[PDB]
Write an enzyme that holds these catalytic residues in place. Structure first.
Site, PDB file in Angstrom:
ATOM      1  N   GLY A  53       2.732   4.054  -1.461  1.00 17.86           N
ATOM      2  CA  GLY A  53       3.021   4.547  -2.819  1.00 17.86           C
ATOM      3  C   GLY A  53       1.744   4.446  -3.667  1.00 17.86           C
ATOM      4  O   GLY A  53       0.718   3.937  -3.204  1.00 17.86           O
ATOM      5  N   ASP A  96      -2.942  13.104   6.664  1.00 15.07           N
ATOM      6  CA  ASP A  96      -1.470  13.196   6.538  1.00 15.07           C
ATOM      7  C   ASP A  96      -0.798  13.174   7.914  1.00 15.07           C
ATOM      8  O   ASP A  96       0.191  12.449   8.111  1.00 15.07           O
ATOM      9  CB  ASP A  96      -1.075  14.434   5.766  1.00 15.07           C
ATOM     10  CG  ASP A  96      -1.305  14.404   4.294  1.00 15.07           C
ATOM     11  OD1 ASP A  96      -1.725  13.329   3.782  1.00 15.07           O
ATOM     12  OD2 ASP A  96      -1.140  15.452   3.663  1.00 15.07           O
ATOM     13  N   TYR A 129      -3.004  22.995   3.239  1.00 19.34           N
ATOM     14  CA  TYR A 129      -3.632  23.158   4.576  1.00 19.34           C
ATOM     15  C   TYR A 129      -2.573  23.848   5.478  1.00 19.34           C
ATOM     16  O   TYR A 129      -1.425  24.008   5.065  1.00 19.34           O
ATOM     17  CB  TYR A 129      -4.068  21.799   5.177  1.00 19.34           C
ATOM     18  CG  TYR A 129      -3.041  20.694   5.048  1.00 19.34           C
ATOM     19  CD1 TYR A 129      -1.895  20.704   5.872  1.00 19.34           C
ATOM     20  CD2 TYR A 129      -3.232  19.603   4.206  1.00 19.34           C
ATOM     21  CE1 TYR A 129      -0.914  19.735   5.705  1.00 19.34           C
ATOM     22  CE2 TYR A 129      -2.287  18.577   4.134  1.00 19.34           C
ATOM     23  CZ  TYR A 129      -1.103  18.679   4.853  1.00 19.34           C
ATOM     24  OH  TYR A 129      -0.216  17.642   4.797  1.00 19.34           O
ATOM     25  N   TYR A 158      -7.698   9.166   2.372  1.00 14.97           N
ATOM     26  CA  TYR A 158      -7.753  10.052   1.196  1.00 14.97           C
ATOM     27  C   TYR A 158      -9.036   9.788   0.401  1.00 14.97           C
ATOM     28  O   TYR A 158      -9.667  10.707  -0.129  1.00 14.97           O
ATOM     29  CB  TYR A 158      -6.560   9.822   0.266  1.00 14.97           C
ATOM     30  CG  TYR A 158      -5.371  10.755   0.531  1.00 14.97           C
ATOM     31  CD1 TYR A 158      -5.276  11.478   1.732  1.00 14.97           C
ATOM     32  CD2 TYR A 158      -4.371  10.891  -0.438  1.00 14.97           C
ATOM     33  CE1 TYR A 158      -4.166  12.310   1.963  1.00 14.97           C
ATOM     34  CE2 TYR A 158      -3.266  11.719  -0.208  1.00 14.97           C
ATOM     35  CZ  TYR A 158      -3.160  12.424   0.993  1.00 14.97           C
ATOM     36  OH  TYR A 158      -2.076  13.214   1.216  1.00 14.97           O
ATOM     37  N   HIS A 161      -4.089   5.262   5.338  1.00  7.52           N
ATOM     38  CA  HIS A 161      -3.888   6.582   4.715  1.00  7.52           C
ATOM     39  C   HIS A 161      -4.619   6.617   3.369  1.00  7.52           C
ATOM     40  O   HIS A 161      -5.302   7.596   3.031  1.00  7.52           O
ATOM     41  CB  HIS A 161      -2.403   6.877   4.497  1.00  7.52           C
ATOM     42  CG  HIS A 161      -2.142   8.299   3.988  1.00  7.52           C
ATOM     43  ND1 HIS A 161      -1.671   8.549   2.702  1.00  7.52           N
ATOM     44  CD2 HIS A 161      -2.284   9.513   4.583  1.00  7.52           C
ATOM     45  CE1 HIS A 161      -1.548   9.858   2.555  1.00  7.52           C
ATOM     46  NE2 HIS A 161      -1.911  10.446   3.668  1.00  7.52           N
ATOM     47  N   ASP A 162      -4.472   5.541   2.617  1.00  2.00           N
ATOM     48  CA  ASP A 162      -5.127   5.434   1.309  1.00  2.00           C
ATOM     49  C   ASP A 162      -6.646   5.571   1.489  1.00  2.00           C
ATOM     50  O   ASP A 162      -7.307   6.292   0.738  1.00  2.00           O
ATOM     51  CB  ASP A 162      -4.829   4.083   0.663  1.00  2.00           C
ATOM     52  CG  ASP A 162      -3.464   4.002  -0.025  1.00  2.00           C
ATOM     53  OD1 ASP A 162      -2.617   4.969   0.074  1.00  2.00           O
ATOM     54  OD2 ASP A 162      -3.167   2.955  -0.704  1.00  2.00           O
ATOM     55  N   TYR A 165       0.768  -1.260   0.000  1.00  2.00           N
ATOM     56  CA  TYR A 165       0.000   0.000   0.000  1.00  2.00           C
ATOM     57  C   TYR A 165       0.799   1.311   0.000  1.00  2.00           C
ATOM     58  O   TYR A 165       0.271   2.361  -0.385  1.00  2.00           O
ATOM     59  CB  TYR A 165      -0.899   0.048   1.222  1.00  2.00           C
ATOM     60  CG  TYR A 165      -2.077  -0.890   1.055  1.00  2.00           C
ATOM     61  CD1 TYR A 165      -3.223  -0.443   0.399  1.00  2.00           C
ATOM     62  CD2 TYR A 165      -2.002  -2.196   1.544  1.00  2.00           C
ATOM     63  CE1 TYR A 165      -4.302  -1.309   0.224  1.00  2.00           C
ATOM     64  CE2 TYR A 165      -3.081  -3.066   1.368  1.00  2.00           C
ATOM     65  CZ  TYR A 165      -4.232  -2.622   0.706  1.00  2.00           C
ATOM     66  OH  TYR A 165      -5.284  -3.462   0.535  1.00  2.00           O
ATOM     67  N   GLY A 223      -1.345   3.809  -5.445  1.00  2.00           N
ATOM     68  CA  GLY A 223      -2.333   2.701  -5.395  1.00  2.00           C
ATOM     69  C   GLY A 223      -2.128   1.791  -4.176  1.00  2.00           C
ATOM     70  O   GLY A 223      -1.651   2.230  -3.118  1.00  2.00           O
TER      71      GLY A 223
HETATM   72 CA    CA Z   1      -1.150   3.736  -1.621  1.00  2.00          CA
END
Ligand code: CA
Ligand code: CA
Length: 118
Positions: free
Chosen positions: A29, A93, A67, A51, A47-48, A27, A31
């Site tokens: 990077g 983030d 931000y 987002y 995190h993915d 996961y 995609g």
């Molecule tokens: Ca990713």
């Protein structure tokens, strides 16, 4: 915006070159899918997911939206005044940069054979 995320990782994981997280596990990077390979990979997975959730806010583009945040010593904070998209992207983030600092980084999990390992 990506630049701010980069600065957050630079700040929470000083001992590791920031670019080491760009192609780690299934996961970290561009995609990702499959089962996270370890705790660091799980950080990236969440995190993915984070987002993806932020993208549900109309016109919210996580890599672009800037931000307000600060990172000093033992502090990483998203500041107020951020609109809804900036506030959600900053939190994703901030929480991922922190999570990265809690996980062991395994050099055996960098740039893996995705087909075989995810
Ligand atoms: Ca990713
Ligand atoms: Ca790769």
């Amino acid at each position: 915006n990506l630049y701010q995320f980069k600065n957050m990782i630079q700040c929470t994981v000083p001992s590791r070159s920031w670019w080491d997280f760009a192609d780690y596990g299934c996961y970290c990077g561009r995609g990702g899918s499959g089962t996270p390979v370890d705790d660091l990979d799980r950080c990236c997975q969440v995190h993915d997911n984070c987002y993806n959730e932020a993208e549900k806010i109309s016109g919210c583009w996580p890599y672009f939206k800037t931000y307000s945040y600060e990172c000093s010593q033992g502090t990483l904070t998203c500041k107020g005044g951020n609109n809804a998209c900036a506030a959600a992207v900053c939190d994703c983030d901030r929480l991922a940069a922190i999570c990265f600092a809690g996980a062991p980084y395994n050099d055996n999990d960098y740039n893996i054979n995705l087909k075989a390992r995810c």
